[PDB]
Amino acid sequence: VFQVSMKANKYQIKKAVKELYEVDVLKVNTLVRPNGTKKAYVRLTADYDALDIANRIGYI
Amino acid sequence: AGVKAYELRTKSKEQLASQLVDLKKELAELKVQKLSRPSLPKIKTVRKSIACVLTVINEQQREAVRQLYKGKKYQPKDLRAKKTRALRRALTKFEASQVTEKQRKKQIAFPQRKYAIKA
Amino acid sequence: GRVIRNQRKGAGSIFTSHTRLRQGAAKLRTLDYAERHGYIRGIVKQIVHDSGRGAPLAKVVFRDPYKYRLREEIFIANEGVHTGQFIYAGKKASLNVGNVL
Amino acid sequence: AAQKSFRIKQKMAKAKKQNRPLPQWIRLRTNNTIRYNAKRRNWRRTKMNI
Amino acid sequence: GKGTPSFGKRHNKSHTLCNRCGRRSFHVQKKTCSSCGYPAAKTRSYNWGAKAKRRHTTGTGRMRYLKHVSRRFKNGFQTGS
RNA sequence: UUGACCUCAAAUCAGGUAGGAGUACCCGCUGAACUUAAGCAUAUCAAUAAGCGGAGGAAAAGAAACCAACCGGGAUUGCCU
RNA sequence: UAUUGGCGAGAGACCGAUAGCGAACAAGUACAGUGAUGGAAAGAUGAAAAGAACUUUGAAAAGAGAGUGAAAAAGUACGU
RNA sequence: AGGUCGGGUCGAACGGCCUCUAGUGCAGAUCUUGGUGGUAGUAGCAAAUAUUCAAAUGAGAACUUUGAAGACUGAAGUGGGGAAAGGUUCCACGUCAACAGCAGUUGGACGUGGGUUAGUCGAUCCUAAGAGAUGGGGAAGCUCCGUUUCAAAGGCCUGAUUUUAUGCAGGCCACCAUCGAAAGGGAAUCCGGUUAAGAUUCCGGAACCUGGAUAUGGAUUCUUCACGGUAACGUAACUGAA
RNA sequence: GAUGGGGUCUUAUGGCUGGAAGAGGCCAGCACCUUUGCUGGCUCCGGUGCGCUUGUGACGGCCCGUGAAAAUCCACAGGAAGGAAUAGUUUUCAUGCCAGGUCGUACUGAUAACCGCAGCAGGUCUCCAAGGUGAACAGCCUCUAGUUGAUAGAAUAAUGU
RNA sequence: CUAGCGAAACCACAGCCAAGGGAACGGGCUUGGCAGAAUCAGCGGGGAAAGAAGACCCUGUUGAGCUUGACUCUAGUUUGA
RNA sequence: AAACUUUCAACAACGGAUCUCUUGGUUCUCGCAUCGAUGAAGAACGCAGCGAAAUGCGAUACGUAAUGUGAAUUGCAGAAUUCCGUGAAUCAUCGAAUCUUUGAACGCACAUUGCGCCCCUUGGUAUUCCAGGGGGCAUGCCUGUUUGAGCGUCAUUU
Ligand SMILES: [Mg+2]
Ligand SMILES: [Mg+2]
Ligand SMILES: [Mg+2]
Ligand SMILES: [Mg+2]
Ligand SMILES: [Mg+2]
Ligand SMILES: [Mg+2]
Ligand SMILES: [Mg+2]
Ligand SMILES: [Mg+2]
Ligand SMILES: [Mg+2]
Ligand SMILES: [Mg+2]
Ligand SMILES: [Mg+2]
Ligand SMILES: [Mg+2]
Ligand SMILES: [Mg+2]
Ligand SMILES: [Mg+2]
Ligand SMILES: [Mg+2]
Ligand SMILES: [Mg+2]
Ligand SMILES: [Mg+2]
Ligand SMILES: [Mg+2]
Ligand SMILES: [Mg+2]
Ligand SMILES: [Mg+2]
Ligand SMILES: [Mg+2]
Ligand SMILES: [Mg+2]
Ligand SMILES: [Mg+2]
Ligand SMILES: [Mg+2]
Ligand SMILES: [Mg+2]
Ligand SMILES: [Mg+2]
Ligand SMILES: [Mg+2]
Ligand SMILES: [Mg+2]
Ligand SMILES: [Mg+2]
Ligand SMILES: [Mg+2]
Ligand SMILES: [Mg+2]
Ligand SMILES: [Mg+2]
Ligand SMILES: [Mg+2]
Ligand SMILES: [Mg+2]
Ligand SMILES: [Mg+2]
Ligand SMILES: [Mg+2]
Ligand SMILES: [Mg+2]
Ligand SMILES: [Mg+2]
Ligand SMILES: [Mg+2]
Ligand SMILES: [Mg+2]
Ligand SMILES: [Mg+2]
Ligand SMILES: [Mg+2]
Ligand SMILES: [Mg+2]
Ligand SMILES: [Mg+2]
Ligand SMILES: [Mg+2]
Ligand SMILES: [Mg+2]
Ligand SMILES: [Mg+2]
Ligand SMILES: [Mg+2]
Ligand SMILES: [Mg+2]
Ligand SMILES: [Mg+2]
Ligand SMILES: [Mg+2]
Ligand SMILES: [Mg+2]
Ligand SMILES: [Mg+2]
Ligand SMILES: [Mg+2]
Ligand SMILES: [Mg+2]
Ligand SMILES: [Mg+2]
Ligand SMILES: [Mg+2]
Ligand SMILES: [Zn+2]
DSSP, X not given: OEEEOTTOOHHHHHHHXXXXXXXXXXXXXXXXXXXXXXXXXXXXXXXXXXXXXXXXXXXX | OOOOHHHHTTSOHHHHHHHHHHHHHXXXXXXXXXXXXXXXXXXXXXXXXXXXXXHHHHHHHHHHHHHHSTTSSOOOTTTXXXXXXXXXXXXXXXXXXXXXXXXXXXXXXXXXXXXOOOO | OOOOHHHHGGXXXXXXXXXXXXXXXXXXXOOOSHHXXXXXXXXXXXXXXXXXXXXXXXXXXXXXXXXXXXXXXXXXXXXXXXXXXXXXXXXXXXXXXXXXX | OOSOOHHHHHHHHHHHHHOOOXXXXXXXXXXXXXXXXXXXXXXXXXXXXX | OOSHHHHTXXXXXXXXXXXXXXXXXXXXXXXXXXXXXXXXXXXXXXXXXXXXXHHHSTTSSOOTTTTSHHHHHHTTSOOOO
């Protein structure tokens, strides 16, 4: 679950996840939160583990 | 602390791009810590250093374009002077100083003489 | 005094004619060349009702003499015209009910 | 409404971000004159008119 | 019934927000703003509306560019460093 | 057939320019009524307010198709009269 | 020569917070109206927060003491 | 008219006299602004059948929670969903100074956070009543008319060429801006489960549509572009530009 | 060119199968601080109708009322062009590959979330609609669901509603 | 009536009468009658009760709506040059 | 006689008068001329370690670069070498930049964060399809260039 700039679409979100984390993403679902920002649920493929890469980013 | 513009000005554009992308990496790594810690004042130095690197890159590219367009008319509008719309539309010093040959003959023959009056 | 009702009628705000359910202006075929030098034959495809008009309309179909297509004129149906009837329009047309001599 | 436009939702988001009391460390600054949020808005008392 | 029960029938906004002034004065059927005159090229202003002119004149905003022309004039529209 | 000329076009042609804001003052156009006349219609308010168009640091005007009737003066503007 | 606008200054037998610009304050703000528009109120602890540690009654707010301060007949409902 | 002194309070400027000057003296103006009374602990807080008992919490319970009992709405509901409108009121934790015209431990209140996931639902596309540029013509002008008009109003497919780009080879075409419906028209998604708060959107399973690439199988052909049925017609397919 | 005999077609709709019982539902037993499960069964066969609601079909009545447009998609006529034999031609047949963006999506929708100065007996568009009585989505009672909200207590004068 | 909550209109000052006179109908003045704290529930005689600078009538050298063979014009239309 | 009513004083209330203040206004005088298609004024939305507003700014976002001064900012936290120095600061100055979405607003629209087209480039086995990045596409008028139209019209033909 990421916070995303308001100008980004699902293509850009997917490409930038693949670049910044070297992860293949299955699908992206975005919404605009009531505070004015954008939230992206990024579901990865079954090969990668979001739990394994979240603490690699530095949060869990 | 942060980066210094005078020591960044010595580098090439590729070193500047590498510096910029690792600075952005560190900005992301501090943004993921700002939610864990109460306060993180270190992020402002990285933000301003990114701003400085971008300023230096833009200045280097603009100077390259200026030296490309050096010594010729029709340089780009963002590079030529801004001053005001009215001053840009005003006559040049040459066009204002243009006079007819008749007025030039008259000014050469009868210029305003310098004279004083006591004796 | 106010502006009276018949004086207001000419602005045409709510006094325009309700023309949603009309098939089109019921006009004759244009006097091109065939109607003034010979005749031309069309066919009454359907006789229909026109809203806001007491007389029935007739959709006559002619052939375009200059392009391969079909033109559809809307005539006002004369009494006795039936569907499938051949209408003859022109200078050399025969004097029958429905013709445009 | 539920089916709303992005402009309306953006103004609603800004109003939600603005609906908050003062940060109480502001009353500790020198030459402070602000005691409370005078531009406070509640949905029951005044409408945004948007 | 012209009062309280008729006030319950009011749920269709006549005006929405204007793009030029953010006012909620843009008439949705006339497609015109009642305050700034959008989409007319000229801004709606009237000498009898002196208070409105005072409300929307120069200086009631940021002046992102006009703040600095006095400094640039005082320095003579200089260039370089 | 070929090449001009004239007129009129078209180009995301080369290079430019206009718009809008402000408007205290300035140049025009348009243009009232309240009011006063102890009524009121010409008149007055007023060649004003509102409306519209257009500029600058000032604008406008300006070197006589002028004033004069004198022993004549001498662009324009402003003050005193 | 004009100049109730703008920028920069210098002044006053001017006003002194119901005055003076509507606005000495987060004022063309809050708020009202569909809208054009309308449009406020609101300055002053103390030299310095030194803004009442601590004890006790009270569920608590607070009170009573104690204390700071030149003065709590200055306690953020604060000059007189 | 007023002036002076004493006492108390207070804390920073002010007076006498000779003159000058004025935004210079209030009881009224259904005066203006602000504040405060008597009325007065008074009128009253009485529509919508109705509440009761115990326990818990808590300083404190007519009103909060749980249980029990009694009732009501009675499917043209006091139910379950939505449109306009509102905008976070939704949900959780803490909380009761103000609001809930009694109360309050409760709340749509206060404080702090969380929450709205779509190729298939809508918008987007189409046009309706209608609005409205352009070419033009009016109008001192702000602007008005008009929407296919007294216009030189454009774009569509095949290719050919393989200095090669896309001109030249060609050929067709004459509507002639745009906006206008979350109820009209319209490509395509269902079930089960899941959260404090989301779901035709998330998870699992099972589908479908559009657009684009494309290979294999199948079909058809030496009678080149299928056969059968009297026929209505049938089929897995079974070229088809303007 | 009837009836009659035999066929053809539209597939709204319905039936069987797949989806799919593995789901969901109803029960039983074994369990345990516990995440809490785990293991078994059953989920079947019918009937009725001027019934209610709704969809649809074939008709009929009414009009000096005959009851939108466009986008969009398909088909047909035509025969341009391209086409096979050691080989092709076809992707309206089947299978197979990739992608499907932007914005909204919470909640109320009203005797407390909208408008009426307000937590106002007012007003504000629409879908679903059980059983009995009864002609009846009348009135009355009940089931599912939802409330038990409207300052209360004690007395029972006048005058009131 | 009690617990809690808790306004408003109105208010020169206030509030017992008879007669007199008086702005010709007094709560106050004059002469008499009289007159004893504090009050509660009702009540509609009075307070020329309250609500609104009378809407009827008159005046204003104040208007406005409407009408016409009022006065003065005028858009449009018609006729001539 | 209390209570109650009225009057006065002290103290306490209510409320904000008076007095004294004043980074504000008002008026006069002097000096100066400087908005915008190189995108103004205005608007919307955002940006701070902890900000709602004002003020500042624009994804380089209470700001960057340059120059000067020369050790701060300050409510707290934090940072320290930033302290005999190319160097602190919410400092001053400002000549270089950035300048979201808009707006005269300019690809067409707009109650839509809607719908396109062209060039270059990257990826998806791709001149055509999808996606990413960058750069563009308004109207009127002027000068010129190129391509044209008209028996408007001249000469030259065969
Ligand atoms: Mg979405
Ligand atoms: Mg309505
Ligand atoms: Mg309307
Ligand atoms: Mg006057
Ligand atoms: Mg007069
Ligand atoms: Mg008079
Ligand atoms: Mg008069
Ligand atoms: Mg004027
Ligand atoms: Mg001049
Ligand atoms: Mg004031
Ligand atoms: Mg004021
Ligand atoms: Mg003292
Ligand atoms: Mg004191
Ligand atoms: Mg002092
Ligand atoms: Mg006075
Ligand atoms: Mg007084
Ligand atoms: Mg008096
Ligand atoms: Mg008074
Ligand atoms: Mg009572
Ligand atoms: Mg009552
Ligand atoms: Mg209460
Ligand atoms: Mg209470
Ligand atoms: Mg809630
Ligand atoms: Mg028009
Ligand atoms: Mg449309
Ligand atoms: Mg639609
Ligand atoms: Mg629809
Ligand atoms: Mg329809
Ligand atoms: Mg829900
Ligand atoms: Mg799924
Ligand atoms: Mg076959
Ligand atoms: Mg038969
Ligand atoms: Mg079916
Ligand atoms: Mg029905
Ligand atoms: Mg949702
Ligand atoms: Mg929902
Ligand atoms: Mg709901
Ligand atoms: Mg409803
Ligand atoms: Mg409901
Ligand atoms: Mg409300
Ligand atoms: Mg209102
Ligand atoms: Mg029903
Ligand atoms: Mg029965
Ligand atoms: Mg019934
Ligand atoms: Mg009640
Ligand atoms: Mg008497
Ligand atoms: Mg009396
Ligand atoms: Mg006497
Ligand atoms: Mg007596
Ligand atoms: Mg007595
Ligand atoms: Mg009574
Ligand atoms: Mg009485
Ligand atoms: Mg009366
Ligand atoms: Mg009177
Ligand atoms: Mg008289
Ligand atoms: Mg009159
Ligand atoms: Mg007459
Ligand atoms: Zn506007």
